[PDB]
């Protein structure tokens, strides 16, 4: 249920909220409007974290609930493919 | 409880106290005020020890008590990331 999902989510929702806060800060680029090189790189890094969090979610969704026929191999492959892209 | 936590902590608290004593000694730099190069390096080393001690703690906190959803992989990854940083 909702309570079980929130409990098993752990700090994945916290990680997503932190990523959203980081994106909001990047909207002003921290202090003044300036982007380029490293400003992108760190963003890429945090993007990976989000995907990792998503992975955890798409784990616990299929762990406590019905296993279905998704398997973790294809989802981790998709995560790596998105990161590379 | 407090007694169980103190027992399972072992010498981790002792390691933290030794690290605090080393930091206090470094405040006077041993004998006279002088810092540079090696004075930092050894400090870095002891810093790692502290993190290791912290790891042990964040182990036994989630071992005897509720497992929760923290997992040891992310905490060791965070320890290594902090050491590298
Ligand atoms: C994965 C493996 C690759 C990852 C590492 C390599 C990519 C690094 C790219 C960013 C480098 C830092 C650039 C910082 C930046 O924006 O500064 C500008 C430099 O512009 C520039 O002129 C950009 C110079 C950077 C070119 C890097 C070319 C890499 C070629 C491939 C290497 C393959 C092996 C790498 C491991 C401003 O400076 P400015 O342009 O105004 O300054 C010239 C006038 N004084
Ligand atoms: C991880 C891999 C890297 C780890 C090892 C390399 C870093 C070592 C840095 C400390 C070296 C010892 C310096 C001690 C120190 O403070 O001595 C001063 C030397 O200053 C200086 O002039 C500093 C010289 C040290 C420069 C080291 C450059 C390393 C380049 C990267 C190497 C990559 C591979 C390493 C495995 C005083 O002397 P002074 O300034 O009065 O003396 C010049 C006038 N006589």
> Which residues of chain A are at the B interface, by a Cβ-Cβ cutoff of 8 Å?
7-11, 60
Return the residue whose CA atom lies nearest to atom 38 of ligand 1.
Answer: A37
A8/B69 CB distance under 8 A: yes
Distance from CA of A68 to the nearest CA of B (A): 22
Distance from CA of B45 to the nearest CA of A (A): 27
The DSSP symbol for B64 reads T
Residue A54: its H or E element: helix A38-63
Q: Give the integer Cα–Cα distance in Å for B17 and B10.
A: 13
């041993």: which residue's tokens? B30
Nearest to B51 by CA among B19, B27, B4: B19
Q: Give the integer Cα–Cα distance in Å for A25 and A29.
A: 6
The answer to whether residues B26 and B43 touch, using CB atoms and an 8 Å cutoff, is: yes
Q: Give the integer Cα–Cα distance in Å for B7 and B30.
A: 33
> Which residues of chain B are at the A interface, by a Cβ-Cβ cutoff of 8 Å?
68-70
Return the residue whose CA atom lies nearest to atom 13 of ligand 2.
Answer: B37
Q: Nominal resolution in Å?
A: 2.3
User: What atom in ligand 2 is closest to the CA of residue B37?
Assistant: 16
Method used to solve the structure: cryo-EM
Chain A residues with CB under 8 Å of B70 CB are 10-11
Q: Tokens for B69?
A: 């959803």
């Amino acid at each position: 249920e909702l309570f079980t999902n929130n409990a098993l989510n752990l700090v994945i929702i916290f990680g997503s909220c932190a990523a959203l806060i980081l994106m909001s800060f990047w909207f002003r680029r921290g202090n003044r409007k300036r982007k380029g090189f490293l400003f992108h790189a760190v963003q890429f890094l945090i993007y990976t974290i989000i995907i990792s969090a998503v992975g955890s979610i798409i784990n616990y969704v299929i762990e406590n609930y019905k296993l279905k026929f998704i398997t973790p191999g294809v989802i981790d492959f998709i995560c790596t493919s998105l990161i590379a892209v």
